[PDB]
């Protein structure tokens, strides 16, 4: 059931971080989730710091919420800020200090491919409007693996490409007219690029769209609450149905209504 995104829910807040090392993060869950994963299996990344490495691994949705992980993976090169996600039982993430992002296999704590997104700008080029390094953003949706990001060519506009999933080539590549570091996030629902105007905002709003599949873009103005005042991290995920986010140290998410 696609369409364009045309309401955004109250931020409800799933867990707190109680340390600085959280104040920023990206959690997430696999929209096509593979053995020994479900839907419920949850991963958290708490990103403050210069040698980010631990993911926590929740098996059910009451164990993110309430308890310890059930399991802490250790990848084997640092990552870099809040852009990764999950997808058909890999994490993709971007290594520190690099335009490289990185496909790792977390059940069998293997690297299954890499890939140097080209001409992407990387550490504090292109980031987003709070900076955190957010040069490189992936993103799953109803059709896949895209990563969004910008480059020199694009004089910091918003590029997004699609991806396989497997290999991690480039498929296809758009450019918009959107300046990425003048918005505080971004994310694809139905194959559409949507922003959000800041992160310190308790009246934010998704602004532009930008819809691959006619090249048009356009202006918005549903509201979008920062409830505290400091998102670092904003996805969709398209199994739920929901936005995912980090803010000021809390894991929050929306609901949200499609045309
Ligand atoms: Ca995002
Ligand atoms: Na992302």
């Not at 993911?55 to 310890?68: A, K, N, P, R, T």
């Amino acid at each position: 059931g696609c369409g364009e995104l045309v309401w955004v829910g109250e931020p409800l807040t799933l867990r707190t971080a109680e340390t600085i090392t959280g104040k920023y993060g990206v959690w997430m869950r696999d929209p096509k989730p593979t053995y020994p994963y479900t839907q419920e299996t949850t991963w958290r990344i708490d990103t403050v710091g210069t040698d980010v490495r631990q993911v926590f691994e929740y098996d059910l949705i009451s164990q993110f919420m309430q308890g310890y992980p059930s399991k802490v993976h250790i990848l084997p090169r640092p990552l870099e800020s809040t852009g990764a996600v999950m997808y058909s039982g890999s994490l993709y993430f971007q290594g520190a200090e690099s335009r490289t992002v990185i496909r790792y296999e977390l059940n069998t704590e293997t690297v299954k491919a890499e890939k140097e997104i080209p001409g992407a700008g990387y550490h504090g080029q292109f980031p987003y409007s709070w900076g955190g390094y957010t040069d490189i953003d992936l993103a799953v949706d109803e059709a896949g693996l895209w990563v969004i990001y910008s480059t020199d060519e694009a004089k910091g506009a918003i590029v997004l490409s699609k991806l396989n999933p497997e290999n991690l080539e480039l498929e296809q590549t758009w450019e918009t007219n959107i300046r990425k570091q003048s918005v505080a996030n971004a994310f694809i629902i139905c194959g559409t690029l949507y922003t959000v105007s800041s992160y310190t905002s308790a009246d934010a709003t998704v602004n532009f769209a930008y819809d691959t599949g006619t090249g048009i873009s356009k202006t918005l103005t549903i509201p979008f609450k920062n409830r505290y005042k400091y998102s670092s991290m904003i996805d969709y995920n398209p199994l739920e149905k929901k936005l995912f986010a980090w803010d000021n140290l809390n894991m929050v998410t929306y609901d949200i209504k499609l045309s």
